[PDB]
Each structure stands twice: as C-alpha cells, then as structure tokens.
Amino acid sequence: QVKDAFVDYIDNPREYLLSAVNTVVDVHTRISDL
Amino acid sequence: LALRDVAARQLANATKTVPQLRTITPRWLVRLLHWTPVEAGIYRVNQVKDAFVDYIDNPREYLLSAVNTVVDVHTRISDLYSNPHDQIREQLRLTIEIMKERQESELINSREYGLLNNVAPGQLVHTRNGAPTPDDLDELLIRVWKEPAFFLAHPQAIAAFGRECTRRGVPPATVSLFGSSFITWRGVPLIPSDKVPLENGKTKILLLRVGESRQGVVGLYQPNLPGEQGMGLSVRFMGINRKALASYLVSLYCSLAVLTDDALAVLDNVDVTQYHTYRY
Amino acid sequence: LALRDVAARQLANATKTVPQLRTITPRWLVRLLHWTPVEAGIYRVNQVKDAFVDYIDNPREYLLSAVNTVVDVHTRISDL
Amino acid sequence: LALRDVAARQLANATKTVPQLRTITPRWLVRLLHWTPVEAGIYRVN
Amino acid sequence: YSNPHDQIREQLRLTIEIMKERQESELINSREYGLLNNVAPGQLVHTRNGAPTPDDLDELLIRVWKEPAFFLAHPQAIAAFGRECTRRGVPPATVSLFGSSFITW
C-alpha cells in the first residue's frame, strides 16, 4: 500500500495466508464394487 | 526525503536457500568402500578351514539390516508452500542425509556388523604410550601389510598423530582424493570420520583393505528395491491419515563383511589430549 | 581324505519350492457351475405364478456377498 | 501378526562366496622377477 | 554341488594358490636354488647394531651399486627400518607399484 495516499509505502503490509478446508470421504469398497 | 529502504524492500523477492543441515559430513568411509549387491538379503562367506583343501561347514551368514524412517508432511504445507522449493523433496532429502550419517556410524559401530566389533584376535594393537605415534601406525601396517587401503580415525586423532609427527621432525605427505587433501603415512591416507567413538579423550584408529578381488572389507546392499532412490535406499508413499498428514517410508538396507581377518586392524587406547612442550 | 560333502554343500544353490498348501482341493463344484455376471450386485429371479400367464410380484433378489481378507507383508521381507 | 523373517528366509537364495583363503599373499617377488624359459629343464650359466 | 560354483575349479584354484605361495617361499629359501643360500662371499653384510638403520641399507646399496631393483624384507623388518628412520628424523619416500605403495630408500 501507498502510505497516506514523495510516494512512500507502508512497511507492514497485510499478508493473506490461504486457508485449507479438508473433508475425508469414506466409501466402503464393497459399495463401490457392487 | 524520498522512498526508504525498508518500504522499498516490501516489493523485493528474497533469495531463499534450502535448509542448511550442519551435521552433514562427507562420509568418506562409504565412498571408499567397495559395495557388493546381495539379491536376497543373505551373504554367506565361505572359508577354507585351517588355511587337502577343506571348507568350514558353519560359515558366517550376513543378514542385511533394515532401518526405516517415516516422514510426515501435512498436505496443506506441500500444497501451499512448494514454490520455489518442493517441501516434500526437501524433507525427504534432509531425512536421507540423516539416515546416511547413521549408516556410516553403523558401518563403524554396529554390534552385529561394524568394523570396531568384527576385529579378529591378533589384529588388535595397543598404543605404547597413549598418543598415536608413527610407531603405532607402523604396527597397524604390520597387521594389514597386504595392500592396505586407508586409515580411519577421528579428526582429533589425526591432529594428535600430526602433533606426534611434528615433535619427531617428520612432515607426513598428503594426497588428493575427491578434491580434498589427506595426510598419508607410508603412502596410506588417514581418512577422518567423526563417527569413530571418542570418549574421555580416548579413541581408536582403524586400518582397512577393501574389495572382493582382494580378500578385504566389502559393504553389502540390496540391489532391486521398489521406489529405489540410491544404493540400498528406497522411498515409498505410505498414505494419508485422517488429519491430512501424508507419510513416506524411507528404507535403507545395508551390512558389512570382513572377508578375511587380516583385512582389518584396530589401534586401541589412542589418546588425543597430549600436547608437547617445546623448550630449546 | 578329501573334501567332504557337508563342506562342499556350502557352495551349492538349493532348489526351493513355493510353500505347499495341503488344504488345496480341486474345487470341482466351482469349475462345474455356470457363472452369470451381475453388473450391480443385484440378481432378481422373476417367476411365473402358479406354473393367462402371471408373474409373482415379490421375486427373490440375490445380493452378492463380500468376503474380505487383509494380507499384511512387512516391507523388509518383500524387499530383502 | 504376519509372516516372520525366519520363515520368509526359507524362500530366499543366499549369495555364496568362493572359499576365502587367508594365507594368500600378493607374492610380490614373483611379479618383480624376470622369467626366462628353459625348453629342456637345464640352464647352464657360462 | 557344482551350481553355481564349479567344485573342481575351486579346489584346483585354491591348490594352485597354495602351491604359488610355496613357490615364492622356495625362491627365497630353497637349498639348491634360493636367494638366501646363493649369496656370494663379500655380498653378505651384517648390521652394526641389530636394528635395520639407514646405514645398513646404504651398505647393501654399496654391494649392489650397479642398478639395484628392490629390497626384499619381512614386513616387520620394513616396520623396524621405518622406526629407525623416524628416530633419525628422516621420512623415506614412497612409490606406487601395481596399485600399491612401498617405502623406498
């Protein structure tokens, strides 16, 4: 970001960390086989 | 006043190194050994009895040993942070480095195989006065007089031998091997290894002949492994658990055989803490 | 006196058979049956009722059954 | 519990070395000498 | 029992190894031929003080000054000569022959 919009930048910019959402899908082998 | 360095640095890509592992050693012994493949994990060393020609009926069989390590990497870490460095590859690389260090230490110190425990009677020499003098290494060379390959010693023991050579006014020669310089005694190089035990300033020095053509020391490994990444080394994907941790199995199969008993000698009671006082 | 058999045998490769399983049978019935594929595990056998021509409305449905066995082999055994 | 190592080893071929003879030496003198053939077993040095 | 190793060939190989060792020992020690018994008068040197010092090997080199090829010694005698060289502060040089290192004087 430009600070207080000479041209200076802020020294503590926000860093966005990607988040993880996990789901485990359990399927019995006989169900998918049959 | 103008744009400052700390603010302009927020736009700059930092150059990131791979993680530095300080316990990595050159592992000279593994590079100096001759390696024999054992296709089914059993190495039987047949011997002539009391060298008509008869063989012994109970030859030693060497079973290759397995060392396993599980490498757990969270799937989100390898998914998110693998640019520009593969996270799984770095974890595996480092894991294999540590396992190779352990393998060298086992080639020296194992209780089943392992040079310091498979030394024959009559091949164990003792220092006359503690410090590793030229005479003690000459004794070692008496024991392995048939084409000796190299000495193996702790770097402090190599320094102590150098001090003993300096006190006697003898500069030992050096050779270049693998782009590195090594002290030699009577043309036999002194190879450093920090896996040789050193406790209370007391260590040991080994002398080896290597190879199957000669009847020397050989390393043993398993040649055809699933997921093979190196000599006797394999990496397998184990699966992912419920908490999204991916596991990898690192396996190392290795052993060591001393084919004849005059291929190895050990100098015992080496003292590395003695310093001469030069007065003139 | 010369080289003995027990000592010379230390140099010889033994011929190893696969493990013999004595409970194996020819299993003639399986070889004599006719085998019908069921693509989705359900086999409905329709029947003529009291053999105009009518069919029963509650035919038997055969559900294929599953028998599972887990085979554990240590990685070092298959490696070595 | 699963298949054990001692039982699985009954299926494995052992690698057998030739018999090791510890009294073998490099015999440097024979390799360093010059060897002269004598066709009829008699060598007369004049 | 000749799979994978020929039994006759191994027996013969080992037998020939033992005979070659005996042959080297006879080249050194035989009573008819044999270097230690076919030494001329004037070519037999004695150590001045027991141990094989540099001066004794210099005497030997006096006796065979015309293009000498090599010394032949027991490995313990080579170690004793090395100890005598170390006591005098002399490191002897080494050569490579047949892929092996040897002390030279």
Can you spell out the DSSP letters for E27-68? HHH-SSS-TTTS--TT-----SSSS--HHHHHHHHHHT-SS-
Chains within contact range of chain A (3+ C-beta pairs < 8 Å):
B, C
> Strands B245-258 and B217-221, how do they pair?
antiparallel
Helix (H) or strand (E) holding B150: strand B150-153
Q: Which amino acid, one-letter code, is at B114?
A: G
Helices (H) and strands (E) in chain D, counts: 2, 1
Residue in chain B lying closest to E100 (CA): B147
- D13/B40 Cβ within 8 A: yes
Residues of D in Cβ contact (< 8 Å) with E71: none
Cα separation, B33 vs B46, whole angstroms: 21
Number of Cβ pairs closer than 8 Å across B and D? 55
Cα separation, B224 vs B212, whole angstroms: 21
Elucidation method: cryo-EM
Cα separation, B117 vs B253, whole angstroms: 19
For helices B134-143 and B155-167, the axis angle rounded to 10 degrees is: 120
- Radius of gyration (C-alpha) of chain E in whole angstroms: 19
Cα separation, B244 vs B20, whole angstroms: 27
Chains within contact range of chain D (3+ C-beta pairs < 8 Å):
B, C, E
Structure tokens at B127: 């220092």
- C13/E10 Cβ within 8 A: no
- How far does A13 lie from chain C, in Å, by closest CA? 50
Answer for the pair C77, C51: CB distance below 8 angstroms, yes or no: no
Q: Residue B161: how many CA atoms within 13 Å on its side-chain side?
A: 30
Structure tokens at B203: 């260590």
Whether C and D touch, i.e. at least 3 CB pairs below 8 A, reads as yes
Cα dihedral sign, B72-B78-B80-B83? positive
Q: What are phi and psi of B22, to 5 degrees?
A: -75, -20
Beta-bridged to residue B177, according to DSSP, are B180
Q: Which amino acid, one-letter code, is at E12?
A: L
Cα dihedral sign, B72-B75-B78-B81? negative
- E21/D23 Cβ within 8 A: yes
Answer for the pair B67, B144: CB distance below 8 angstroms, yes or no: no
How far CA E14 is from CA of B51, B57, C2, in Å, comes to 10, 17, 14
Cα separation, B19 vs B95, whole angstroms: 12
Cα separation, E89 vs D30, whole angstroms: 33
Chains within contact range of chain B (3+ C-beta pairs < 8 Å):
A, C, D, E
Closest Cβ opposite residue C10 in set B52, B57, B225: B57
From the centroid of its chain, how far is CA B215? 21
Q: Residue B63: how many CA atoms within 13 Å on its side-chain side?
A: 12
- D20/B215 Cβ within 8 A: yes
CB-based contacts of B31, cutoff 8 Å, min separation 6: B178
| Selection from A8, E89, E33, A26 nearest residue B1 by Cα | A8
Selected residue of C72, C75, C77 to mutate for chain B interface (largest B Cβ count, 10 A): C75
Answer for the pair E19, D24: CB distance below 8 angstroms, yes or no: no
Answer for the pair E33, E27: CB distance below 8 angstroms, yes or no: yes
Q: Which amino acid, one-letter code, is at A33?
A: D
**Burial of B165 from C-beta contacts in 10 A (0-12 / 13-18 / 19+):** buried
Helix (H) or strand (E) holding B182: strand B180-185
How far CA B29 is from CA of B215, B269, D35, E43, E95, in Å, comes to 18, 22, 40, 47, 24
Beta-bridged to residue B240, according to DSSP, are B246
- How far does C54 lie from chain D, in Å, by closest CA? 57
Residues of C in Cβ contact (< 8 Å) with D11: 16, 18-19
- How far does D22 lie from chain E, in Å, by closest CA? 11
- C11/B236 Cβ within 8 A: no
- How far does D21 lie from chain C, in Å, by closest CA? 15
Residues of D in Cβ contact (< 8 Å) with C11: 16, 18-19
Cα separation, E74 vs C21, whole angstroms: 63
Cα separation, E13 vs E3, whole angstroms: 17
Answer for the pair B199, B13: CB distance below 8 angstroms, yes or no: no
